[PDB]
Design a protein around this ligand. Structure first.
Ligand SMILES: Nc1ncnc2c1ncn2[C@@H]1O[C@H](COP(=O)(O)OP(=O)(O)O)[C@@H](O)[C@H]1O
Ligand SMILES: Nc1ncnc2c1ncn2[C@@H]1O[C@H](COP(=O)(O)OP(=O)(O)O)[C@@H](O)[C@H]1O
Lengths: 92, 153, 43, 49
């Protein structure tokens, strides 16, 4: 009788310790550590899936050249300079 | 396999259920520990009562009954020591289990604080990619863009 | 009963005894200051 | 008036008794300080609607 009571007084603690360890392990496989980049952590798999689509839609419709960006920026600067100069000069 | 985003939410819900299950199991563990502590206290109380009875029995001057009572209380003292030994380790173990649960809680909260941002970024990107296949570019003329197919038709 | 009493304690941690000591000392400081000034005001 | 007999024990008891009421008063004063600030914003929303 006493032996059985003693064993029943420990089954619960052992179950709790097993469950805590299982949950602790199951935490890792989702995120783990930020610097993993292991493609096993579910966040990196989402990140690669994002970048794949972002590049795939870029291939179909090419982005404008940096030369075009420089040209349009300079055109905007020339425009605003002309407006400000004539705008100061009109009230004068 | 399946799309990662749906299994992300499914796994997070399952993890929530497992966490509350762990909380309940730890509650039962601390309950049983308290019960064992109470039983140890009761046993030592009974041993003290037997010692007190022997104290009054010795007043007669017949030491034989005192010897009988003192030999009787030895088993109870041994049982009290046996339970005191086990408590000395169960108390040190439950604290570490509680610490593990406390850390897991914060980790889960942190992951749930980012699932939404990741889903929003995924939806924005897929919509941005889908915007193209209808029209794309005015000079695209790929016959895949739905406007050029209508124009040729 | 004990299971529920511990389970609701896990969800909302009780304060550490250090906080209890601190608040007890704060109460003692308050009562001593009040009684000292309270004696000294009529004097 | 309790300290008037010259025995400070009753004064100590009364001062220890009033501490709970002071704490409760402060607890309610903390909550009023935010409820008053929130009801005004709700009223403004209603007025604009
Ligand atoms: N301390 C650490 N810092 C950064 N990354 C780590 C660290 N420890 C492990 N990793 C990551 O773990 C990954 C290896 O896991 P992986 O090879 O994907 O698992 P499997 O072998 O099951 O495919 C590496 O990409 C590495 O970035
Ligand atoms: N910068 C651009 N200016 C004009 N048209 C472009 C540009 N980039 C891509 N295209 C268009 O993309 C089209 C090619 O797509 P297409 O070969 O029909 O797709 P798929 O390979 O799926 O059949 C070409 O007709 C071309 O006009």
């Amino acid at each position: 009788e006493r032996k059985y009571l003693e064993l029943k007084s420990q089954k619960n603690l052992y179950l709790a310790r097993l469950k805590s360890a299982i949950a602790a392990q199951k935490i890792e496989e989702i995120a783990g550590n930020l610097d993993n980049a292991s493609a096993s952590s579910l966040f990196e798999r989402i990140e690669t899936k994002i970048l794949e689509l972002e590049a795939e839609r870029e291939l179909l419709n090419p982005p404008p050249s940096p030369l075009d960006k420089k040209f349009e920026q300079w055109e905007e600067q020339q425009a605003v300079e002309a407006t400000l100069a004539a705008m100061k000069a009109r009230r004068s | 396999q399946e799309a990662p985003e749906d299994l992300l939410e499914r796994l997070l819900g399952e993890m929530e259920l497992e966490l509350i299950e762990l909380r309940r199991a730890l509650a039962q563990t601390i309950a049983t520990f308290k019960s064992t502590e109470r039983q140890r206290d009761a046993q030592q109380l009974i041993a003290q009562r037997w010692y007190e009875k022997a104290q009054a029995a010795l007043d007669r001057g017949n030491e034989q009954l005192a010897r009988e009572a003192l030999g009787q209380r030895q088993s109870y003292q041994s049982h009290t020591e046996a339970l005191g030994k086990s408590l000395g380790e169960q108390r040190a173990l439950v604290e570490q289990v509680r610490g593990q649960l406390q850390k897991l809680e914060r980790k889960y909260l942190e992951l749930k604080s980012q699932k939404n941002l990741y889903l929003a970024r995924l939806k924005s990107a897929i919509a941005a990619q889908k915007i193209e296949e209808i029209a794309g570019n005015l000079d695209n003329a790929s016959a895949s863009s739905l406007f050029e197919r209508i124009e040729t038709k």
